[PDB]
Design an enzyme around this catalytic site. Structure first.
Site, PDB file in Angstrom:
ATOM      1  N   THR A 177      33.101  40.048  48.805  1.00 38.89           N
ATOM      2  CA  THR A 177      34.161  41.068  48.837  1.00 38.89           C
ATOM      3  C   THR A 177      33.981  42.084  49.953  1.00 38.89           C
ATOM      4  O   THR A 177      32.967  42.757  50.011  1.00 38.89           O
ATOM      5  CB  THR A 177      34.384  41.675  47.442  1.00 38.89           C
ATOM      6  OG1 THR A 177      34.732  40.550  46.636  1.00 38.89           O
ATOM      7  CG2 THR A 177      35.518  42.683  47.480  1.00 38.89           C
ATOM      8  N   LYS A 227      30.127  35.818  37.546  1.00 42.20           N
ATOM      9  CA  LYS A 227      30.458  36.973  38.417  1.00 42.20           C
ATOM     10  C   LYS A 227      29.978  38.228  37.681  1.00 42.20           C
ATOM     11  O   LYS A 227      30.422  38.513  36.546  1.00 42.20           O
ATOM     12  CB  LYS A 227      31.948  36.995  38.757  1.00 42.20           C
ATOM     13  CG  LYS A 227      32.430  35.773  39.505  1.00 42.20           C
ATOM     14  CD  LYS A 227      33.926  35.678  39.662  1.00 42.20           C
ATOM     15  CE  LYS A 227      34.512  36.865  40.385  1.00 42.20           C
ATOM     16  NZ  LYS A 227      35.979  36.695  40.611  1.00 42.20           N
ATOM     17  N   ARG A 280      37.281  28.409  47.640  1.00 37.20           N
ATOM     18  CA  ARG A 280      37.538  29.146  46.380  1.00 37.20           C
ATOM     19  C   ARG A 280      39.060  29.148  46.046  1.00 37.20           C
ATOM     20  O   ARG A 280      39.872  29.545  46.917  1.00 37.20           O
ATOM     21  CB  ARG A 280      37.020  30.564  46.499  1.00 37.20           C
ATOM     22  CG  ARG A 280      37.384  31.510  45.353  1.00 37.20           C
ATOM     23  CD  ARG A 280      36.510  32.750  45.489  1.00 37.20           C
ATOM     24  NE  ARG A 280      36.908  33.778  44.523  1.00 37.20           N
ATOM     25  CZ  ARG A 280      37.866  34.669  44.710  1.00 37.20           C
ATOM     26  NH1 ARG A 280      38.469  34.794  45.867  1.00 37.20           N
ATOM     27  NH2 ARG A 280      38.194  35.513  43.738  1.00 37.20           N
TER      28      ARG A 280
HETATM   29 MG   LIG Z   1      36.589  40.767  40.540  1.00 33.88          MG
END
Ligand SMILES: [Mg+2]
Ligand SMILES: O=P(O)(O)OC[C@H]1O[C@](O)(COP(=O)(O)O)[C@@H](O)[C@@H]1O
Ligand SMILES: O=P(O)(O)OC[C@H]1O[C@](O)(COP(=O)(O)O)[C@@H](O)[C@@H]1O
Ligand SMILES: [Mg+2]
Ligand SMILES: [Mg+2]
Ligand SMILES: [Mg+2]
Lengths: 501, 501, 501, 501
Positions: free
Chosen positions: D306, D248, D54
């Site tokens: 995350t 996203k 990424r």
């Molecule tokens: Mg974000």
């Protein structure tokens, strides 16, 4: 919503005010404890949804532990709510010794060659690390070449490359950069050190806790049913048969002996901190799900512990992985979730309890859709359990705001709790020991009331106590269970569906 | 072992004694009815497990039907046991006429050429069969050359080979050996005859039955909800609103309109004899399973009828396919199984009821393993239904000998029955009309008792009634439901699990 | 639709023309058999959906049985379709003897006191019934006081009240009105008569059938695996290892030993006639469902037999209980349904086959919704069974008109059949013995073809053979399985999904 | 043991060597990038199980991103293994500006009073933080007194206490200790800023990445399907229609529009960091489970992102809650797990990938027991999907080491992946763009091979490629699918079960 999943909060200096100072402020330890200010901070944790406080006898002498329990008794009156008192034993800990001089720690590089001493009652040097082994046991003959000595939550690896019989020292290689600080946790996985079933220090600590007044003991590093039964004997000898024992599962022996431990104990604490060092860390989630299901099938209490909101020791918001961990413990079927450093030692004890309560309350709403526990598979092994099954059926068939049980010992509340009904459980009981003993059961709101007579209408009492507590209002449907009539019934035998006036 | 599946037995000459003679003996029809001797034979059927008797108004006249109803009332006093009284209407049907000279029947061989008359109000001869067409309709122009005329459940087929305009007779060929008797059902598949909404004879027959005292009306060839609502209007107008209406489904229009028919009716009789001629015979098992499932889901009664033990009309043992059929009707979920010619017209009416009872009792023991009905799928649409679901849960969780309900209207008993608990259901009610109206619900044993006052213990009454009935003894576990207390409860609101003293 | 459930039809005089006369016509037995007319009637049963003919060696000498098998070989060429040949053994039958004089039968009343003789080779009188016991065994010492001697399909009960050691006669009480006719079936339930594992007469009959050319043997009254293994030994000794053995389960010993019988046999015939006399008639439906499930789990063939359309021996239409019986056998999971007297002895053999085929074809459409068999629970125990599971998955995922298997031995066809795919199964095989051996497997259409070479495209062959047979047309989707390539593959290893051109 | 769950690793300075210095060493930022030394560190991550890297365009400029992409291309040549290239857009976001004097960051204490500037195009100072607002929007009037400004995943909170109209600055109080660094994400919960449809910087960044060569674009803060379709239009216009778009989901509008976003996108990245600030944090686990289920049902890719191993940014061991989170993401059904700061910004980038791989490999072994996804519920919407269902069935029926698909576009591999077979999936494809585009599908090992001709044996090629890759050895069973023959098959149409020679 009422929070069904219970919270165990560990107490420590984070909530304690000393001569106007907060933990971390310069001179804090110079001041004397402000009991009332400390009690007001503890009362906020109670109001935010702490259901039981953990007194960790790993840290702090009897005087500190006794004063902290006394502070909690004041906090309950400020909050207007009672909590459970849980003692956590030191158990068979191994810690790094103090260092020669003022030295508090040393740094090491990968590859560095050093020594670990087994001789007890000596200080560490940078090149010779000394261990404080519980009971001053000699561990030299229990640790083979190729074993790993892990320091401070498994952060610094020491590989045992050789054994010096002449000094009973381990010749170790540092496996990664890191610090050895004084008085840090040591684990030596896949070794059998003949720690006693119950050390004299743990016997002493339990006897002190029982004298102060506790409801629960969490026994560190339970290996076998014998470790539980030795504590049970002290509770019975001292007239404390009402105290419930949670076996802490934190090593391979405890996992291998889980069925016999569950049979001996009143519940299990999944002590994931030590468990994830002592067994492969990637297996802890497998064992967690399996332990929760087995303990619920036994009708006993499970506590999921350690690192659940770890980031909140230093930050006011948790990570996404911490939120996920708490949520998934609830969905797995845990009775209770726990805080250790987050509530004992961190900068944000109240926010840690609040955040855990918010997650717990949201997760309980998804148990119908995602919940791992399956009450349809249980054998109903008694007439009280048949009534618990029927209560769960009623809460599945219609919208039930509350289940009320008039329970002398809490047995009916514990069986209703086992079935995880889609309702809160108000448990009306008649003594404070039974009241506090129910505080870690999923969904149970314990409430002390006068024992009903032959002439009382127990269904009117149930509705009145529910309305007094603010749990229900006009038009709400409730399920009430009781042994009818008082003096004739030998068990809960009656279920009433009632609309609140 | 109590029989949960109810039996409807059709009455006719098979159980009737006339001047000391049994049906089939020479001179039988030249004698008059021996009422006491007949009532003693009927009492044996009640003791063997007939729960309701069927009076088929397609046969005989009002005097024969009225005398037969009076004989059953004496039979109940002999047996010491009440039964239901069910009237079965003619409906929009065709029947063979009476014969000239009161011959009852003639026998025919394949290839004979005979005639079928359409003129209304005349009698048959051997060579010219006359039709009684509901509404006295002329069907000559409705029936083409090549149609089949079927007599008596399709036992004898006649092929229309020509039409005689001078006499409005069908010229038919006998297709197979068999009998044409008086007042036998006639089907003419694939024709559209405009039968009226409610025939004047049906209006008469229903009013006569209501005057005599009946509990159920089975309505023949129900086409639409209006066929049920027309009968309902008569029941409500005469003060007989307690009479329950079973719609007989026996043609394609009834199948097409099943949902609205179930909504208007109290139950369904699956009238397989006519259904299997009017729709393709191989669809009848599909419709049977689907009707049973829908009627149970509506909380209503379903009766499976026709040819269940057909061979026992003539032989003392049923075939393997008859036993399979009765067994499978039970497993499919039927409330009741029915005997037609076996009980009304055969050599073994008692043995037929005994045989049906034996199969029904064995099959109810396999409902847990094989049963098609699934009460887990129901929406619990009221608080009484919630209690019925909880009762089922209690009988699934432990061994319950009996469920006792104190029921004013039978509503709670009907909802417990809907859930098919693993127990017999004792329904204590307070009037004979409610008692008889429950006699076709699965598992329900109705029993008349005094309405409890507000000083009475209903749980003690329930246990005492159950013991006195011989349904339970010391040490059996029972579930008792009631609306507690009398004079305050809206509905059944209490479930008790009780060990019989 | 193709009929997936197979039909076994019993042959007898009903289809046989003798000098222009039909069975039942005066002088019929005076005429010689018309082989070609008889073959034309048998060909109509083939076209109507008979898949295998049963030769019952209980009735008719070797000459009659041999001529009937020869007649069926002509019928297959008229129909253009092959059938299976099944021999049914006499087994351990007990029959009433001929009577003294011309007397063919006597009537008896309940209560009458008479005698049953055990001495063999004597004639009956009205007061002394003699028995023809298979192998002329002496049964006197095997029958206790209180046993029941049942005559003609359990219709007349004889209770054994005393035993006369001096004449070895049973003193019996007639339990119900009835007839004892010459040469009628006798059952004596709950007795152990030491019949041999294989009688000389059954050995003789099997050896004669094997010489004529049969595909199946149905062994009467199988008690143990030994009864199967004795017949297996003759089939192997004579070079007839390809013949498949169906154990007939018709008594308690066979039910008790079912698992070992299934292991020894190629399939089970549920011989409900004798089973419902030898065990409680109300248990036959329980045993039927359990036998079907166990035989399907073994990957073997089950035949449900006896009384399935019994009324059609005399009437052109079946009862509603007979239609229900056939339908429910299919839903229970039977491979095949059977006709006995309906096709052998009745007035309506062709209509009996047609009616059974219609019901069978309708019932196969409800197996997705109601079918009792559960293929998801099986262990897939070989790579061919893994491919059979994948074929069933493909037929569940999309609309598949046909599954084609190129099968040397039929093993792949039998495993596909075990999984009951929602498709017909075309089994392309390369010898007539394998072809005829597949004729009772659920869903299997056997078709003889040339063995493919290394250079043939087996997927094009499969599509061409399916199109030739008229089983598929343009746009239909088929699943083809084969062992690819020929000479390298050791088993079916390939599945192709193909659209017909 | 191959890792089925794919890893996305974010690249940043943590793996970069500059003038022989490691990230964190004094003088690091005064050196230039050492491309070979950096490529060697990146190759270690590829070998540890990073499947896609990424490139976060919120950080650095086009030159830094372009050089980092070139370093990864060298790393693939060192490792001998290809990876996916994923570009992560800025989107409609707020970021902190660069600081005056190229300070990178400042540290703040609770209670400090500082300012936040709204003027666009300026730099920050320690006392006045400037914002880079997408579209260069002025947000001064959008933010009321009392709003919270959160910096860097909500690590540092600023409370707006006053607004200064003279400078259009917010006057804020620092709520907690922490850092404000350059180019950090800024959230202002409960405000509505009118971000444009597609920012000019995003248009630039996407075109730059497409010119460099990428396989995936993760679109930040997708609000509606139009946000995906705007990016799709650019991919199609530049000849990059093979690039896959991951939306996203990180705000309420994205959640509200999820179904239309899934329909437009190739997959979803569950961007938990921003999601947990923009929606209530305790809802993120609910949304995570629901997104994973919907994306799998659509046959698309889902990435969970995350804080998965957040503590490994600073420590060599993850917390118990981090291991639980990674384990539960796998059980929930994720295709891929992602590392952000752990790999880009931390002290242990290699150990973080190794740790993630270990947990992902253990969790894939519990999918049969605990897995949330249910492929039994899917509609098989095409013949390729029917084959994918059959492959899953074969891997459920027996032990299959590997599924091999010969796939031109990857369609068959994506459908087999959707079904989550109990096997690794070897996808043999014929162009490098198809190969890299499969690198984030669950279980898929892509491998480049020559397109087979019509003379080739595809089953032999499949086995040879699998052996040569070391995925299988002699005696392993594999499933192979392909479109047979080459030049005639429309689609995958053949499944073979093969024992490796
Ligand atoms: Mg974000
Ligand atoms: O709970 P539901 O389905 O609303 O039914 C409530 C009704 O049932 C009744 O309780 C009657 O029940 P019983 O006839 O069984 O006593 C009525 O008094 C009441 O109105
Ligand atoms: O079976 P579906 O879903 O209609 O897909 C058929 C399509 O897939 C393809 O077979 C491509 O599959 P592969 O990329 O896996 O080879 C196309 O040739 C064909 O049009
Ligand atoms: Mg510990
Ligand atoms: Mg009728
Ligand atoms: Mg037999």
């Amino acid at each position: 919503m009422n929070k069904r999943v219970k919270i165990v909060a560990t107490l420590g200096p984070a909530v304690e005010i000393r001569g106007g100072k907060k933990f971390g402020e310069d001179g804090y330890w110079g001041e004397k404890l402000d009991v009332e200010a400390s009690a007001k901070n503890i009362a906020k944790l109670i109001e935010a949804g702490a259901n039981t406080f953990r007194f960790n006898f790993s840290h702090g002498d009897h005087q500190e532990q006794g004063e902290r329990m006394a502070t909690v008794k004041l906090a309950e009156k400020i909050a207007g709510k009672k909590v459970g008192f849980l003692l956590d034993t030191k158990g068979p800990e191994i810690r790094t010794e103090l260092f020669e001089g003022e030295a508090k720690e040393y740094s090491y590089k990968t590859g560095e060659k050093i020594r670990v001493a087994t001789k007890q009652g000596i200080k560490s040097t940078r090149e010779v690390i000394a261990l404080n082994v519980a009971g001053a046991l000699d561990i030299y003959d229990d640790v083979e070449v190729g074993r790993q000595v892990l320091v401070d939550d498994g952060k610094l690896g020491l590989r045992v490359v050789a054994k010096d019989d002449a000094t009973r020292e381990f010749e170790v290689e540092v496996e990664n950069d890191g610090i050895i600080a004084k008085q840090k946790g040591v684990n030596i996985p896949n070794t059998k050190i003949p720690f006693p079933a119950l050390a004299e220090r743990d016997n002493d600590d339990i006897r002190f806790g029982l004298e102060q007044g506790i409801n629960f003991i969490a026994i560190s590093f339970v290996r076998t049913a014998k470790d539980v039964n030795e504590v049970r004997a002290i509770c019975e000898e001292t007239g404390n048969g009402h105290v419930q024992l949670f076996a802490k599962i934190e090593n391979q022996q405890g996992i291998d002996n889980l069925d016999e431990i569950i049979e001996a104990a009143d519940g299990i604490m999944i002590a994931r901190g030590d468990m994830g060092i002592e067994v492969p860390f990637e297996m802890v989630p497998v064992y967690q799900k399996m332990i929760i299901k087995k303990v619920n099938a036994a009708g006993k209490v499970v506590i999921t512990a350690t690192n659940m909101l770890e980031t909140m020791t230093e930050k006011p918001r948790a990570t996404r992985s911490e939120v996920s961990d708490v949520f998934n413990a609830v969905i797995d079927g845990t009775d209770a979730t726990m805080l250790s450093g987050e509530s004992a030692n961190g900068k944000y004890p109240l926010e840690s309890v609040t955040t855990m309560a918010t997650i717990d309350k949201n997760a309980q709403a998804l148990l119908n859709e995602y919940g791992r526990l399956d009450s349809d598979s249980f054998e109903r092994n008694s007439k009280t359990e048949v009534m618990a099954s029927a209560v769960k059926d009623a809460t599945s068939s219609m919208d039930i705001k509350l289940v009320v049980t008039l329970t002398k010992t809490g047995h009916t509340a514990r069986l209703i709790s086992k079935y995880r009904p889609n309702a809160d459980i108000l448990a009306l009981t008649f003594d404070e020991l039974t009241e506090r003993g129910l505080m870690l059961n999923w969904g149970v709101i314990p409430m002390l009331t006068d024992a009903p007579s032959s002439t009382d209408d127990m269904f009117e009492i149930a509705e009145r106590k529910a309305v007094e507590a603010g749990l229900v209002e006009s038009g709400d449907d409730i399920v009430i269970v009781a042994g009818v009539p008082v003096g004739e019934a030998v068990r809960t035998n009656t279920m009433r569906i009632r609309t609140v006036r």
